Amino acid sequence: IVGGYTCGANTVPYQVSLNSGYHFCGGSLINSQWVVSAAHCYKSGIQVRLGEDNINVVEGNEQFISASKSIVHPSYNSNTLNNDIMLIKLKSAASLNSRVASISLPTSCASAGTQCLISGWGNTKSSGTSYPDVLKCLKAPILSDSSCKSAYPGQITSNMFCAGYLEGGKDSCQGDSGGPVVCSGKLQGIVSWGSGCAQKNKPGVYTKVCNYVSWIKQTIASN
Ligand SMILES: Cc1ccccc1-c1cc2cc(C(=N)N)ccc2[nH]1
Ligand SMILES: [Ca+2]
Numbered sequence: 001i002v003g004g005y006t007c008g009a010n011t012v013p014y015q016v017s018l019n020s021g022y023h024f025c026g027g028s029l030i031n032s033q034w035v036v037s038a039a040h041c042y043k044s045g046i047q048v049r050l051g052e053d054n055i056n057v058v059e060g061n062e063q064f065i066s067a068s069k070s071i072v073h074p075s076y077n078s079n080t081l082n083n084d085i086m087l088i089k090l091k092s093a094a095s096l097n098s099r100v101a102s103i104s105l106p107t108s109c110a111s112a113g114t115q116c117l118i119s120g121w122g123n124t125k126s127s128g129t130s131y132p133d134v135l136k137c138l139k140a141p142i143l144s145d146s147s148c149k150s151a152y153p154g155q156i157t158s159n160m161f162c163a164g165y166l167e168g169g170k171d172s173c174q175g176d177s178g179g180p181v182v183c184s185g186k187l188q189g190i191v192s193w194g195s196g197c198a199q200k201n202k203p204g205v206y207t208k209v210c211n212y213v214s215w216i217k218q219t220i221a222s223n
Helices: 145-151 209-221
Strands: 015-019 023-031 034-037 047-050 063-072 086-090 115-120 136-141 160-163 180-183 186-193 204-208
Touching: 015 034, 023 047, 023 180, 023 186, 023 209, 034 186, 034 209, 086 209, 115 186, 145 160, 160 186, 186 209, 204 209
Parallel strands: none
Antiparallel strands: 015 023, 015 047, 023 034, 034 086, 047 063, 063 086, 115 136, 115 180, 160 204, 180 186, 186 204
């Protein structure tokens, strides 16, 4: 997260860290047994880490649970990142508490202008590299689809939306991928892609979760 702020320990209880010997992507807990992340974060040997703040220090509220199965969206296209969403099932149900909680799925899509909360352990520099140990936060508005498509001609599909600031300075970044974009208490987006980080006229691109609620619900119910 670039241009953001330190969230505060466990202030984003649904935020998860995907670990394969190191943190490589974020995710969102949707119930005690399932996590939603980006399809481009897919990999074998995933360990889901819940209740995390400083990902390099065991602070006392963590839960480390291995994934038993991963399900990448059937229509995911790695070249364009269309349908960049995946589900991860925990080998054992997480113990839900104030520091480890699920985030609700949307019942409808969010409108442009709605303010959302984006979070992650990604790079905090727009130019260069610096990875935080604690969770970073960023409040950003959903941008109009026209401003989104103008920034990325022929690259935006109905399954993506942009959020952030066209002036630059505030954006998600490498390492935040797969993480949550929560608006009005609903998981509306997944950190997916963009151009560089916090660059002018190049806002972040997010997977439009509201288009996948039926798939998520049916897939979890059958697995
Ligand atoms: C997914 C991917 C695949 C291959 C190269 C780069 C990416 C990429 C670009 C961005 C850009 C942002 C951003 N909000 N600036 C966040 C994450 C992110 N991931
Ligand atoms: Ca920790």
